[PDB]
Nucleic acid binder design. Sequence first.
RNA 1: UAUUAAUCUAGAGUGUGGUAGGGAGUUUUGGAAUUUCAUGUGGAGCGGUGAAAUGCGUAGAUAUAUGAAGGAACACCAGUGGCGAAGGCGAAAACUUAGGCCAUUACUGACGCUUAGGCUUGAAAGUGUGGGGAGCAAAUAGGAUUAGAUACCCUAGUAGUCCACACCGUAAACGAUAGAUACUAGCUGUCGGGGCGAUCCCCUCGGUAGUGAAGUUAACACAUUAAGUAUCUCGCCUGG
Lengths: 83, 53, 62, 65, 141, 167
Amino acid sequence: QIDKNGIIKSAQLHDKDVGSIQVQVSLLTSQIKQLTDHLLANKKDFISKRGLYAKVSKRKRLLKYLKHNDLEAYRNLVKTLNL
Amino acid sequence: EVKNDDLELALKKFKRVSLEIRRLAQRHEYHLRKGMRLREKRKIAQKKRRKFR
Amino acid sequence: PVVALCNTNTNPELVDFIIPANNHQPQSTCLLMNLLADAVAEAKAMPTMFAYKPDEEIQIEI
Amino acid sequence: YCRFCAIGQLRIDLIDDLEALKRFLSPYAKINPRRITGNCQMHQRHVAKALKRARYLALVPFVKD
Amino acid sequence: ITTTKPIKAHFDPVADLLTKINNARKAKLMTVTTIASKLKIAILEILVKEGYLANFQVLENKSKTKRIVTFNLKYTQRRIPSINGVKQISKPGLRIYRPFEKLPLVLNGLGIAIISTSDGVMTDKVARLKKIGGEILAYVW
Amino acid sequence: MQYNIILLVDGSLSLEQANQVNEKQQQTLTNVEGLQTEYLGLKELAYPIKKQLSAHYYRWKFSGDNQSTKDFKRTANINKQVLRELIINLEREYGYLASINPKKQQLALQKRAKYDEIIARENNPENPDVPVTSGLASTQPRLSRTEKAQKPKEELWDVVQKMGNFD
RNA sequence: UAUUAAUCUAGAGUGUGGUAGGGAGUUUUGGAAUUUCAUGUGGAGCGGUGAAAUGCGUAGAUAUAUGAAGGAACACCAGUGGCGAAGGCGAAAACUUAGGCCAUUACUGACGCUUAGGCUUGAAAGUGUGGGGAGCAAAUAGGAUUAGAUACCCUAGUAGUCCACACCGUAAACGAUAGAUACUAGCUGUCGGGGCGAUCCCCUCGGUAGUGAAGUUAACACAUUAAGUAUCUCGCCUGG
């Protein structure tokens, strides 16, 4: 469980945007936190490791896209440390 | 088996079901591999489909 | 050239004059054949039979 | 014809229609081919799974000759 | 008019429109839709005003978000296509340019080509007339 | 979520002891107790389970958390008075949406369609008649506006005459 | 075209609703069955072969009723079946979960393809640590086959054949079709969703299959899941 309904309302810039970048990266880091525990529990579920690699690659792509187009791209670092 | 109450109709049912039993047994006295298994499975499926189509 | 009683699904590139009418069924083939015979019958100074007569054609099958 | 493609009971367990499972059950406690179930995929896999469910719970015999 | 189905730009303007021309020439059809672009607008109008295909219309949606173009090809009662073959020499990653002295003719007696030097679209004859070299679009015959 | 639990009893003992051991097994749940008390009477098994031929089958269904299951697994197996351990949460393909369930009319249509009451009714399934609702609204409307004026052309079939002038 | 500041969604993802599937792992078990060990039945044979032999056989074989123990794989539905990046994934579950699909009228706005390097798995066998050897059977032995039996069958039998740790990365790892965006005749069968709405069909978004146009390929043959015309990125071919 990730409790998407409880985390969607915590990183938003408006009251109707649901597809923003910040909510996307919040979802991605929440998935990272969940699946890290999942993989350290089950060490042979390699399809889960491939999926985690896919989400971390997508998160890195999003971070690069932000750092390329927008200077305001480090709010999510000061709350949840990355890199 | 069960249902032996007729002189010949029950005999026909018994022989048909026993032929089925023997055919089911034919795949259980020799060694085979998974690919070979898939092979006779596909062959039997195609043969039955040609029987019905 | 040659004219063809062109049933649908046939190749139109082979045919030069197309007649789009039913021919698999006989009820249309008889009428079409009679019409073409009447069309070609004028060469003999022999009057046509159908296409101008109000009487209906005959059809018998069983 | 399939009994289950037409009514849309939308759920299969032991106490939806057990006598229907028995009718679907072979005289030798097996499962009838596609010619009897009347369908291809989904109600068929539903009833096969349910017959397995009852088999584990011993509502129908594994083998009865 | 109101085709009520979506279309999208495929990879790139020049090859996107040339793919639809390929479809036109091989499928022997009449009307083909696609998305709009200034380059495609200019090449279509210069190609039609010289008399090489049929007419075309530019269309837009209810909201000012998307612009599309459909195009028709000249045909005859004898059912003869007006196009025999199209080939682009320039491709994504290969943007070759020519000077005025070396302007590639197109099978001089027959072919038609467009050269975007600096002013949108100019055909080969006016390109020679103005003595200016640029980017060759493609060869059509 | 909601759960479906089946429980068994050992031997042909009385009913009060069965209810008592059922209650004893019920308290094993970790935090949530929404039990439903019912049983299927007494049914004879087609094959022996451990050494007996008949037993009582009890059922429960509560809505709680998923941790309320493993405790039952290590407790019921330890209890030597149970014979079977079916535990199903919800994961068989099921529907409860209030737009598909109101379709039992088929059954209401079924029995009367197949029930034999008059020697004149002759029916057989797999027969197409295509009842029509006269409207689907599934067409994905997209309108456009014209911004340039040009003229189209009409098309006929390629009719060819082989020189038509042999005379 | 680069460069650029702002841009607008259809590209593309995210949310919502519906729906599907042997997707992966972990933990519990069940059955029939084989083998073995026992308690009763019975007396000359039993096990194999184009024909015969090795082996077992009054220290009651085989057969036969029941019990007990245990190791592997999950008949039956399982099909022109579905998912899975690949191999593969079929008894029953609970758990943690993975990727889809469909309407997406919501949200953001070019974030999208490739990616030599770097990593993620990897059919089987084998290697080094624990269980087990129930069946199987490389090797070894014995009996027949022919001048020849290190192979062709029978008897046993060697590790391995599974469950845990660390490997090793080769497969005819096959659709012999690198991975995406377009379009193009049809026809038939088949799975999911939507409304329609007893099953029966009418459409749409999709995948899985055959048939078969132009057109292409030397030919076989490919085709709406291209080997057709296009285009993009990484690899390979320049004779054994």
